[PDB]
């Protein structure tokens, strides 16, 4: 529940949940980038896009 | 799992349970008006006696699908093991952003 | 090498009395240090500032009575935490409740006992810590109740059970730790592991009283011995790493199956040494080798 | 010398030093 | 190479602060510090050898790259580069930019 | 040709860079090409000294 | 006591440690007893499976001690491959000082050949600690059965069995 | 998710996610006209460069 | 856990041979950056 | 003797005291700023 | 276990030619593609996205 101050104009309540973003750059060949990005309070499937 | 008008965000909510027999996933679309949540003889929802998707393969809103991205252990996605172009998302359709 | 439970009279001393220099208690240690007699560096007292130099002289030459009660009463209450006579969050109450008790009775013969009881309660931690490793104490007394209630030495069919009497007693003596012969319900039952994944009834064993001596067919599971419950079957596989020779391996399954229970263990420790190698060689295979378990299945089925 | 400075906590002098050269 | 020639007297050939000092002055700079704040008075020589760094060779430092094709659509500017780093081109990413 | 960086819209990749140059110490002295000139109002206008 | 299901460990990946064991139902067969001629089969086929999952539990992993430890050393859980491959350089370390600064600019080496290589190890600097990294979960805790549910109230029960559980304190 | 014209009461929308290791939160509101909801390169919703 | 975020220490998930030249001949690049350092916290 | 029991003719913070929370003073600094929670003495030389 | 891959591998390679050439009729491209050191490639599934 976000019982906040009433305002004049439509505003986007852009909430940020602190969720870590790590990209490990595995480089087993000179000039090859193979990476996976994952988050902790976030599964990489279920999201708003 | 009922879903409201003009919304785009709905996942399945099932935690740790049994899975010992599984061939895979299947999904189609159907109206709430033509057929309801079955289990009863004559429930307070019928009012459309038209062609029902659940009987004659009458499905139609099967084109209205964007992405169905899978999760296997509530952290990593099922394509996590990078098998596709998209790392996690199961894009069924993308309207004009990279013709490729 | 490892330690016993961190000495309960010393843990409470660690948190109360001075660490570096107790000038009265370690008197001839400070006196050795100030007389320039210490072997590390003699003039460590000479090169020090003059004011704290004097503080060492005034305190050591005239020994000052330091407070000993709070490292004696806490020595009991922290031993009460290690012997588990109180909970860890109870350290606020019992520490001072007995200090308020000795505030009323500072000066009877009771505190002369108290310090003798300090040496008794600290030893009671050391006695019980060596005694909980051998959980035989809450097991042998329980087995005494089992041996008395259950009718002993009555196989009037055929007798192989006299060897089995000692077999249950060997389970108490060999493995004592988590092996508790719990008497919750009226049926006796033994736990083997700290989490109890094979805790069957020793009164499911009462199925064996008519099967102490019957006829053997041939070498394949018998035409009669299908009656033996997986409950009692669980017990007879659990006594199997304890007793082998004694029960007749040719007259009934008390012995023939007990030799066959060693066949289950005999395959297990071989397959243990088999699995620890194929899993270890995962750099050269590069696959989830379930064939390590499939060969294990093949070495038990196709015989 | 260990006697030469006034030190904190019953210890004569305590932490050793290093000063940087000009060029850089 | 032999690193003890003419700077030995000047003590420049030296490796630390207490090197060409008399070993009885270490406990006055360190211990009685803010009192005798003196360690640069005897200026300690640097430790910058020839061991791994020296490249007496035509080694490239700043190289340009300009795209293959051009697309002049109003909303999204596209530029295709096919970058190639040969050998020993050891850049850290924050160096690279795009000259608009 | 495995996709190296594939971040979605629920990520502020552009706007994460704002915080990194704030927590560096001082951005009060300005950079030319990167225009590190912080969009900073004066306290005289907001909280009006009246 | 007589008919329980084999317990199945629930998982959390990035932690490495399993949450706790749970029974199977969405594939569990009908227990409406078919008759006296099939009751011994539905209790019998399951009985040998109970020994299938019991025997492999001691083979696949060493028997249970700390049922769920987060502070976990590596012994059966494998530390990644320790093998380096070292190659030489087209240009030498000491055969370059003669030329560029003097006059002759530079742009096996076909000037003055030398052979000098040094190999250093590839292994993880210090041993593997914490939870399971990549994929060693099945080999660490194989689905195992407690065939007599909560037999023993106050002493001990299935402890780390609960998903709502940490090793420090119960409850 | 937006707060309409005059809003004193507003719920949350997204239901199912898994949370394993957090850090905290942050929030600041923003007008719809001032900055667009990202999607397309060209926007008539953001014809207010201020 | 193999990503060094449920681990114990930073310098122990890479190679020990690369560790040596990091505090004596490092002045050419101030590098405690290319692989992130995690920290332990009581829970 | 009572003069230096007031932590006046002491040498240092973590050292002059009982080792019960000496372990904890070195581990805790951000939870509690413990260095300003106790007297640290400094004495005149010879 | 004696069949299809368990380790990570992408099914498709979204490849771009290095050099370009356009002229009166021809649309030349000299694409430099090397088949992965272990994995195989099918020619009936190979096409051009223009």
Secondary structure string (H, E, C) spanning chain C: CCCCCCCHHHHHHHCCCCCCCCCCCCHHHHHHHHCCCCCCCHHHCCCCCHHHHHHHHHHHHCCCCCCCHHHCHHHHHHHHHHCCCCCHHHHHCHHHHHHHHHHHCCCCCHHHHHHHHHHHHHHHHHHHHHHHCCHHHHCHHHHHHHHHHCCCCCCCCCCCHHHHHHHHHHHHHHCCCCCCCCCCCCCCECCCCCCCCCCCECCCHHHCCCCCCCCCCCCCCCCCHHHCCHHHHHHHHHCCCCCCCCCCCCCCHHHHHHHHHHHHHHHHHHHHHHHHHHCCCCCCCCCCCCHHHHHHHHHHHCC
Quick one: how far is CA G150 from the chain centroid? 28
| Rounded-to-integer distance, Cα J30 and Cα J27, Å | 9
- CB contact set of B47 (below 8 Å; sequence gap of 6+): B33
Closest chain G residue to E55, measured at CA? G96
Interface test with F, best of B79, B87, B90, B98 (most F CBs within 10 A): B87
Phi, psi of C272 (to 5 degrees): -60, -45
Q: Give resolution in angstroms.
A: 3.8
Do B52 and B60 meet the contact criterion of CB atoms below 8 Å apart?
Answer: no
Do H18 and G10 meet the contact criterion of CB atoms below 8 Å apart?
Answer: no
| Candidate from F4, F6, F10 with C-beta closest to A48 | F10
Compute the nearest-CA separation of K28 from chain F (Å): 22
Could you tell me the two tokens for A7?
Answer: 């305002």
Could you tell me the two tokens for C19?
Answer: 């660490």
Phi, psi of C121 (to 5 degrees): -75, -35
Last residue of a domain, one of C82, C116, C134: C134
C97 and C158 share a domain? Answer: no
Do C and G touch, counting CB pairs below 8 Å (3 needed)? yes
Do E71 and E77 meet the contact criterion of CB atoms below 8 Å apart?
Answer: yes
Give ∠ CA A3-A6-A9 in degrees, rounded to 5.
Answer: 130
Do D21 and E43 meet the contact criterion of CB atoms below 8 Å apart?
Answer: yes
| CA-wise closest residue to F18 among F41, F38, F32, F33 | F38
Do I1 and G16 meet the contact criterion of CB atoms below 8 Å apart?
Answer: yes
C22 and C167 share a domain? Answer: no
**Contact call for A37 and F6, based on CB within 8 A:** yes
- CB contact set of G5 (below 8 Å; sequence gap of 6+): G23, G24, G25, G28, G145
- CB contact set of C143 (below 8 Å; sequence gap of 6+): C168, C169, C172, C181
Do B85 and K14 meet the contact criterion of CB atoms below 8 Å apart?
Answer: yes
Other Cβ atoms closer than 10 A to C136: 18
Closest chain F residue to K9, measured at CA? F2
The size of the E-H interface in CB pairs under 8 A is: 5
**Contact call for B82 and K10, based on CB within 8 A:** yes
**Enclosing H/E stretch for H27:** strand H25-31
| Candidate from K7, K11, K49 with C-beta closest to B84 | K11
Angstrom distances, CA of residue E27 to CA of B1, B73, H42:
79, 62, 71
**Which residues of E fall within a CB distance of 8 Å from I29?**
92
Q: What is the largest CA-CA distance in chain B?
A: 51
Q: Please give the DSSP secondary-structure letter assigned to residue I37.
A: P
Do C129 and C5 meet the contact criterion of CB atoms below 8 Å apart?
Answer: yes
Do G5 and G24 meet the contact criterion of CB atoms below 8 Å apart?
Answer: yes
Q: Please count the CA atoms within 13 angstroms of the CA of G131 that sit on its side-chain side.
A: 20
- CB contact set of G22 (below 8 Å; sequence gap of 6+): B16, B17, G7, G8, G10, G163
| Rounded-to-integer distance, Cα C49 and Cα J11, Å | 10
Q: Please give the DSSP secondary-structure letter assigned to residue B77.
A: B
Per this entry, what is the length of chain G? 171
Residues pairing with H2 in the sheet: A12
User: Which residues in A1-49 belong to E strands, given as ranges?
Assistant: 11-17, 22-26, 34-38
Residues pairing with G10 in the sheet: G20
| Rounded-to-integer distance, Cα G57 and Cα G144, Å | 7
C176 and C300 share a domain? Answer: yes
- CB contact set of G148 (below 8 Å; sequence gap of 6+): C189, C196, C199, C200, C201, C231, G1, G4
Q: Which residues of I touch A (CB under 8 A)?
A: 3, 5, 36
Do H29 and H3 meet the contact criterion of CB atoms below 8 Å apart?
Answer: yes
H20–G contact, CB cutoff 8 A:
yes
**Enclosing H/E stretch for E71:** strand E70-71
Give ∠ CA C111-C117-C121 in degrees, rounded to 5.
Answer: 140
Q: Which chains touch I (3 or more CB pairs under 8 A)?
A: A, E, G
Angstrom distances, CA of residue C234 to CA of C174, C189, G150:
19, 11, 16
- CB contact set of C297 (below 8 Å; sequence gap of 6+): none
C194 and C220 share a domain? Answer: yes
* 3-state class percentages of chain E: helix first, strand second, coil last, to nearest 5: 5, 5, 90
C123 and C165 share a domain? Answer: no
| Rounded-to-integer distance, Cα B97 and Cα B91, Å | 12
Other Cβ atoms closer than 10 A to B89: 22
Give ∠ CA A17-A21-A25 in degrees, rounded to 5.
Answer: 175
Quick one: how far is CA F48 from the chain centroid? 26
C275 and C172 share a domain? Answer: yes
G162–B contact, CB cutoff 8 A:
no
C27-34 vs C50-61: helix crossing angle, rounded to 10: 140
DSSP-based three-state secondary structure for G58: helix
Do G14 and I1 meet the contact criterion of CB atoms below 8 Å apart?
Answer: yes
Do B and D touch, counting CB pairs below 8 Å (3 needed)? no
Could you tell me the two tokens for C276?
Answer: 């620890």
G120–I contact, CB cutoff 8 A:
yes
**Contact call for C275 and G59, based on CB within 8 A:** yes
| Candidate from C199, C230, C288 with C-beta closest to G152 | C199
G45-60 vs C291-301: helix crossing angle, rounded to 10: 130
Angstrom distances, CA of residue C2 to CA of C5, C6, C133:
10, 11, 14
Query: In chain C, how many domains are there?
Result: 2
Sign of CA dihedral K17, K21, K27, K28: negative
Do C217 and C223 meet the contact criterion of CB atoms below 8 Å apart?
Answer: yes
CATH of residue C66's domain is: 1.20.120.1500
Q: Please give the DSSP secondary-structure letter assigned to residue G7.
A: P
Q: Please give the DSSP secondary-structure letter assigned to residue B80.
A: G
Do C72 and C121 meet the contact criterion of CB atoms below 8 Å apart?
Answer: no
C253-278 vs C230-238: helix crossing angle, rounded to 10: 70
| CA-wise closest residue to B8 among B89, B66, B78 | B66
Any alpha helices (H) in chain B, and if so which ranges?
Answer: 53-56
Last residue of a domain, one of C98, C115, C134: C134
Could you tell me the two tokens for G124?
Answer: 């993880």
DSSP-based three-state secondary structure for G50: helix
G79–E contact, CB cutoff 8 A:
no
| CA-wise closest residue to G59 among C277, C272, C295, C293 | C272
Could you tell me the two tokens for B48?
Answer: 């459309």
DSSP-based three-state secondary structure for F28: coil
**Which residues of D fall within a CB distance of 8 Å from E12?**
none
**Contact call for J18 and C18, based on CB within 8 A:** yes
Q: Which chains touch G (3 or more CB pairs under 8 A)?
A: B, C, E, H, I
Number of H helices and E strands in chain G, helices first, is 2, 2
Q: Please count the CA atoms within 13 angstroms of the CA of A15 that sit on its side-chain side.
A: 13
Could you tell me the two tokens for J44?
Answer: 């005149």
Closest chain G residue to H18, measured at CA? G12
Do I42 and J27 meet the contact criterion of CB atoms below 8 Å apart?
Answer: no
Interface test with G, best of E54, E55, E56, E60 (most G CBs within 10 A): E56
Compute the nearest-CA separation of D6 from chain E (Å): 8
| CA-wise closest residue to B33 among B64, B63, B6, B54 | B54
| Rounded-to-integer distance, Cα A39 and Cα A22, Å | 7
Q: Please give the DSSP secondary-structure letter assigned to residue E44.
A: P
Residues pairing with K20 in the sheet: K29
Angstrom distances, CA of residue G147 to CA of G19, G20, G53:
20, 17, 12
Do C27 and C60 meet the contact criterion of CB atoms below 8 Å apart?
Answer: yes
| Rounded-to-integer distance, Cα G146 and Cα C191, Å | 11
**Which residues of D fall within a CB distance of 8 Å from E40?**
19-21
| Rounded-to-integer distance, Cα B45 and Cα B37, Å | 9
C51 and C95 share a domain? Answer: yes
Q: Please give the DSSP secondary-structure letter assigned to residue H45.
A: S
| Rounded-to-integer distance, Cα C80 and Cα C100, Å | 17
**Contact call for J41 and D8, based on CB within 8 A:** yes
**Contact call for E56 and G107, based on CB within 8 A:** no
Method: X-ray
| Rounded-to-integer distance, Cα B83 and Cα K10, Å | 4
Number of H helices and E strands in chain I, helices first, is 0, 0
Q: Which chains touch C (3 or more CB pairs under 8 A)?
A: D, G, J, K
| Rounded-to-integer distance, Cα C59 and Cα J8, Å | 14
Compute the nearest-CA separation of H1 from chain G (Å): 30
**Contact call for K19 and E68, based on CB within 8 A:** yes
User: Which residues in chain G belong to E strands, given as ranges?
Assistant: 8-11, 18-22
Could you tell me the two tokens for C125?
Answer: 């931690």
Question: Chain G neighbours among E 25-84 (CB < 8 Å)?
Answer: 54-58
Could you tell me the two tokens for F15?
Answer: 């706007």
Other Cβ atoms closer than 10 A to B71: 20
**Contact call for E82 and K16, based on CB within 8 A:** yes
Question: C-alpha dihedral over B3, B7, B8, B11, to 10 degrees?
Answer: -40
| Rounded-to-integer distance, Cα D9 and Cα C55, Å | 13
**Contact call for J4 and C52, based on CB within 8 A:** yes
Question: Chain G neighbours among I 11-30 (CB < 8 Å)?
Answer: 11-17, 19
Compute the nearest-CA separation of B76 from chain F (Å): 15
| Rounded-to-integer distance, Cα G89 and Cα G67, Å | 52
C50–J contact, CB cutoff 8 A:
yes
- CB contact set of G151 (below 8 Å; sequence gap of 6+): C182, C184, C189, C191, C196, C199, C201, G1
G135–B contact, CB cutoff 8 A:
no
Question: Chain B neighbours among F 1-50 (CB < 8 Å)?
Answer: 2-3, 6
Do A and C touch, counting CB pairs below 8 Å (3 needed)? no
Other Cβ atoms closer than 10 A to E32: 21
Compute the nearest-CA separation of C15 from chain D (Å): 21
C234 and C190 share a domain? Answer: yes
| Rounded-to-integer distance, Cα C243 and Cα C170, Å | 8
Sign of CA dihedral G23, G24, G29, G30: positive
| Rounded-to-integer distance, Cα J22 and Cα E36, Å | 32
Closest chain J residue to C11, measured at CA? J20
| Rounded-to-integer distance, Cα C5 and Cα C82, Å | 8
- Each residue of C258-289: b (16+ CB within 10 Å) or e? bebbeeeeebbeebbebbeeebeebeeeeeeb
Query: Given phi > 0 = left and psi -120 to 50 = alpha, else beta, which region is G104?
Result: beta
DSSP-based three-state secondary structure for I9: coil
- CB contact set of C59 (below 8 Å; sequence gap of 6+): C23, C24, C30, J1, J4
Residues pairing with B91 in the sheet: B67
Do G16 and G68 meet the contact criterion of CB atoms below 8 Å apart?
Answer: no
| Rounded-to-integer distance, Cα C180 and Cα C175, Å | 10
Compute the nearest-CA separation of F11 from chain A (Å): 9
The size of the A-H interface in CB pairs under 8 A is: 90
Last residue of a domain, one of C84, C107, C134: C134
Phi, psi of C46 (to 5 degrees): -75, -45
**Contact call for I5 and G125, based on CB within 8 A:** no
C178 and C59 share a domain? Answer: no
Closest chain A residue to B74, measured at CA? A43
Could you tell me the two tokens for C258?
Answer: 């007990």
DSSP-based three-state secondary structure for F17: helix
Do J and A touch, counting CB pairs below 8 Å (3 needed)? no
**Contact call for K1 and C289, based on CB within 8 A:** yes
Parent domain of C89? 1-134
Quick one: how far is CA C208 from the chain centroid? 32
C147 and C168 share a domain? Answer: yes
| Rounded-to-integer distance, Cα G109 and Cα C245, Å | 77
Residues pairing with G8 in the sheet: G22
Do C97 and C103 meet the contact criterion of CB atoms below 8 Å apart?
Answer: no
C73-82 vs C110-132: helix crossing angle, rounded to 10: 20
| Rounded-to-integer distance, Cα B60 and Cα B49, Å | 17
C242 and C160 share a domain? Answer: yes
C54 and C77 share a domain? Answer: yes
| Rounded-to-integer distance, Cα G72 and Cα G65, Å | 12
| CA-wise closest residue to C242 among C152, C143, C176 | C176
| CA-wise closest residue to G165 among G39, G21, G24 | G21
Compute the nearest-CA separation of C54 from chain J (Å): 9
**Enclosing H/E stretch for E78:** strand E78-79
Q: Which chains touch K (3 or more CB pairs under 8 A)?
A: B, C, E, F
Q: Please give the DSSP secondary-structure letter assigned to residue G136.
A: -
| CA-wise closest residue to C106 among C66, C72, C79 | C72
| Rounded-to-integer distance, Cα E45 and Cα E13, Å | 7
Do B8 and A48 meet the contact criterion of CB atoms below 8 Å apart?
Answer: yes
Other Cβ atoms closer than 10 A to J35: 11
Residues pairing with C55 in the sheet: none
Q: Please count the CA atoms within 13 angstroms of the CA of J46 that sit on its side-chain side.
A: 16
Compute the nearest-CA separation of D23 from chain C (Å): 39
Quick one: how far is CA E41 from the chain centroid? 26
Quick one: how far is CA H1 from the chain centroid? 5
Could you tell me the two tokens for B13?
Answer: 């909510």
Could you tell me the two tokens for C155?
Answer: 């196989």
């Amino acid at each position: 529940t976000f019982e906040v101050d009433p305002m004049d104009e439509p505003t986007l309540l852009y909430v940020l949940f602190e969720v870590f973003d790590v990209v490990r750059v595995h480089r087993p060949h000179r000039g090859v980038i193979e990476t996976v990005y994952l988050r902790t309070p976030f599964s990489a499937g279920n999201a708003t896009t | 799992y009922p879903i409201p008008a003009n919304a785009t965000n709905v996942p399945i909510s099932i935690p740790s349970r049994n899975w010992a027999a599984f061939r895979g996933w299947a999904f189609t679309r159907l109206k709430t008006k033509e057929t309801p949540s079955l289990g009863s003889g004559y429930d307070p929802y019928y009012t459309y006696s038209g062609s029902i998707p659940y009987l004659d393969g009458t499905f139609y809103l099967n084109h209205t699908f964007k992405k169905v991205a899978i999760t296997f252990d509530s952290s990593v996605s099922w394509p996590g093991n990078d098998r596709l172009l998209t790392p996690n998302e199961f894009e069924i359709k993308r309207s004009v952003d990279g013709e490729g | 090498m490892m330690q016993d439970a961190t000495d309960p009279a010393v843990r409470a001393a660690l948190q109360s009395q001075p660490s570096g220099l107790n000038s009265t208690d370690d008197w001839r240690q400070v006196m050795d240090r100030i007389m320039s007699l210490t072997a590390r560096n003699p003039d460590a007292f000479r090169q020090q500032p003059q004011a704290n130099r004097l503080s060492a002289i005034l305190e050591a030459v005239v020994p000052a009575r330091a407070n000993p009660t709070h490292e004696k009463v806490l020595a009991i209450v922290n031993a009460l935490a290690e012997n588990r006579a109180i909970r860890p969050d109870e350290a606020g109450l019992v520490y001072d409740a007995l200090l308020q008790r000795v505030a009323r009775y500072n000066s009877g013969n009771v505190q002369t006992n108290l310090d003798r009881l300090v040496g008794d309660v600290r030893e009671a931690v050391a006695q019980r810590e060596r005694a909980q490793q051998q959980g035989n104490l809450g097991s042998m007394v329980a087995l005494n109740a089992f041996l008395s209630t259950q009718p002993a030495n009555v196989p009037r069919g055929q007798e192989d059970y006299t060897n089995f009497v000692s077999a249950l007693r060997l389970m108490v003596t060999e493995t004592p730790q988590s092996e508790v012969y719990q008497s919750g319900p009226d049926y006796f039952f033994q736990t083997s592991r700290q989490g109890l994944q094979t805790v069957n009834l020793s009164q499911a064993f009462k199925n064996l009283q008519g099967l102490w001596g019957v006829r053997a067919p041939t070498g394949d599971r018998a035409t009669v011995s299908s009656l033996l419950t997986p409950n009692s079957r669980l017990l007879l596989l659990l006594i199997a790493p304890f007793t082998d020779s004694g029960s007749v391996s040719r007259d009934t399954y008390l012995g023939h199956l007990l030799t066959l229970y060693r066949e289950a263990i005999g395959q297990a420790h071989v397959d243990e040494h088999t699995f620890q190698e194929i899993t270890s060689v995962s750099r050269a295979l590069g696959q989830e080798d379930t064939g390590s378990l499939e060969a294990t299945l093949n070495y038990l089925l196709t015989n | 010398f260990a006697s030469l400075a006034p030190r904190h906590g019953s210890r004569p002098f305590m932490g050793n030093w290093q000063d940087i050269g000009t060029s850089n | 190479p032999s690193m003890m020639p003419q700077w030995s007297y000047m003590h420049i050939s030296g490796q630390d602060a207490s090197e060409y000092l008399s070993p009885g002055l270490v406990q006055f700079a360190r211990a009685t510090e803010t009192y005798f704040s003196l360690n640069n008075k005897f200026r300690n020589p640097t430790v910058a050898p020839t061991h791994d760094v020296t490249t007496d060779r035509s080694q490239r430092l700043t190289l340009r790259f300009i795209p293959v094709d051009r697309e002049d659509t109003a909303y999204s500017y596209k530029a295709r580069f096919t970058l190639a780093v040969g050998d020993n081109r050891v850049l850290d990413m924050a160096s690279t930019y795009f000259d608009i | 040709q495995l996709n190296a960086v594939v971040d979605l819209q629920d990520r502020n990749t552009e706007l994460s860079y704002q915080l990194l140059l704030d927590s560096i110490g001082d951005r009060t002295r300005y950079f030319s090409m990167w225009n590190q000139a912080v969009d900073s109002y004066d306290p005289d206008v907001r909280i009006i000294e009246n | 006591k007589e008919i329980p299901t084999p317990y199945m460990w629930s998982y959390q990946p990035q932690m490495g440690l399993a949450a706790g064991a749970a029974q199977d139902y969405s594939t569990r067969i009908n227990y409406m007893s078919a008759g006296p001629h099939m009751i011994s089969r539905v209790n019998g086929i399951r009985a040998h499976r109970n020994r299938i999952l019991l025997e492999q539990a001691a083979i696949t992993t060493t028997p249970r001690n700390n049922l769920n430890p987060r502070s976990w050393p590596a012994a059966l859980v494998y530390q990644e491959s320790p093998a380096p491959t070292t190659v030489v350089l087209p240009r030498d370390a000491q055969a370059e000082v003669q030329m560029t600064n003097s006059g002759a600019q530079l742009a096996r080496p076909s000037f003055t050949p030398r052979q000098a290589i040094l190999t250093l190890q590839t292994s993880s600097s210090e041993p593997r600690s914490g939870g399971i990294g990549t994929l060693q979960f099945i080999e660490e805790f194989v689905p195992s059965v407690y065939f007599n549910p909560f037999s023993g109230p106050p002493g001990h029960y299935p402890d780390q069995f609960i998903p709502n559980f940490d090793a420090v304190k119960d409850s």
